[PDB]
Amino acid sequence: EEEMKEQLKQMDKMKEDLAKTERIKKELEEQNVTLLEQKNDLFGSMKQLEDKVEELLSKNYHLENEVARLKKLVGER
Amino acid sequence: SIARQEEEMKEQLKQMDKMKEDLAKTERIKKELEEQNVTLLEQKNDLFGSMKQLEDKVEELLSKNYHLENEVARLKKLVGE
């Protein structure tokens, strides 16, 4: 009579434990998606900065050569 | 009702095992997710750090560019370019 209890009771605790663990799992999943998005956004920004760096290093070097050329023409130093 | 009780306890135990099995699977996925989130968080902070270093580099490159363009304009004005 009171034996089916101990098993039924245990089953209830397990049903609860499973529901809880699943909530944590769903929570971790949401965090995972949020982190992946934040990374992709960061990668994109880094790409734009890297391109900008390449663009400026190239323009500056050319400008430095031009400065050198224009200077010899005017007789500067 | 006894044969009925036992038959129910057997089924009950079968459901209990299926429950244990679903819990153990959820736990494996949980740990895998925890580890992935730790890795993602470390990479995020690293990217952030690198982004700040890149911005500082651009900031300086922009100042050199500004000065160079001023110099070239000053010179081209004298030559006639």
Side-chain angles (χ1 to χ4, degrees):
Chain A
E1 198 155 273
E2 267 237 29
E3 186 181 3
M4 297 164 95
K5 283 207 187 174
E6 190 72 344
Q7 182 59 25
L8 260 175
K9 280 188 177 181
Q10 288 212 346
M11 286 185 79
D12 277 322
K13 179 189 177 182
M14 289 218 81
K15 278 184 176 177
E16 294 162 18
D17 266 330
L18 181 62
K20 294 188 181 185
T21 307
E22 268 162 13
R23 294 195 217 105
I24 298 176
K25 162 195 163 192
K26 188 187 186 301
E27 146 194 326
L28 293 163
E29 281 169 7
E30 293 176 9
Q31 289 174 2
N32 194 259
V33 178
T34 297
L35 290 168
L36 294 175
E37 291 181 344
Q38 297 178 327
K39 265 192 58 188
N40 269 330
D41 282 355
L42 276 169
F43 272 133
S45 296
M46 282 184 57
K47 171 63 177 168
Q48 279 175 354
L49 290 161
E50 277 156 354
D51 290 349
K52 177 60 69 177
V53 168
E54 175 51 49
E55 184 207 312
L56 289 169
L57 290 171
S58 300
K59 291 185 174 183
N60 291 349
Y61 189 41
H62 178 230
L63 290 169
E64 291 183 317
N65 292 334
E66 277 295 82
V67 168
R69 182 181 67 87
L70 290 163
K71 280 189 167 196
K72 292 174 180 60
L73 289 186
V74 303
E76 253 176 49
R77 297 177 183 184
Chain B
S1 289
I2 180 182
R4 209 183 193 142
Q5 288 178 5
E6 292 287 3
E7 183 185 301
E8 270 194 43
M9 177 64 144
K10 175 171 179 162
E11 294 177 355
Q12 242 188 57
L13 283 174
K14 285 194 178 302
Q15 284 193 311
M16 174 45 99
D17 278 342
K18 175 52 159 53
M19 197 132 57
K20 280 175 182 172
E21 295 163 16
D22 284 342
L23 182 58
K25 177 183 183 185
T26 302
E27 199 70 354
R28 289 189 298 277
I29 294 166
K30 171 173 174 297
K31 297 307 161 187
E32 286 150 49
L33 285 169
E34 286 181 345
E35 296 175 13
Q36 289 180 197
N37 287 350
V38 175
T39 296
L40 291 170
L41 215 234
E42 288 174 341
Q43 298 173 339
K44 174 196 167 187
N45 296 344
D46 286 354
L47 285 166
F48 194 76
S50 283
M51 189 184 92
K52 295 300 162 187
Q53 284 167 188
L54 279 168
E55 293 179 326
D56 289 338
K57 195 176 178 186
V58 169
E59 178 175 323
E60 182 58 40
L61 288 178
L62 290 171
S63 300
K64 284 167 183 158
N65 187 253
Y66 174 77
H67 173 64
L68 289 172
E69 299 237 347
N70 285 338
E71 276 291 70
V72 171
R74 187 177 66 69
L75 299 161
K76 283 191 177 184
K77 195 67 176 179
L78 298 180
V79 177
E81 284 186 32

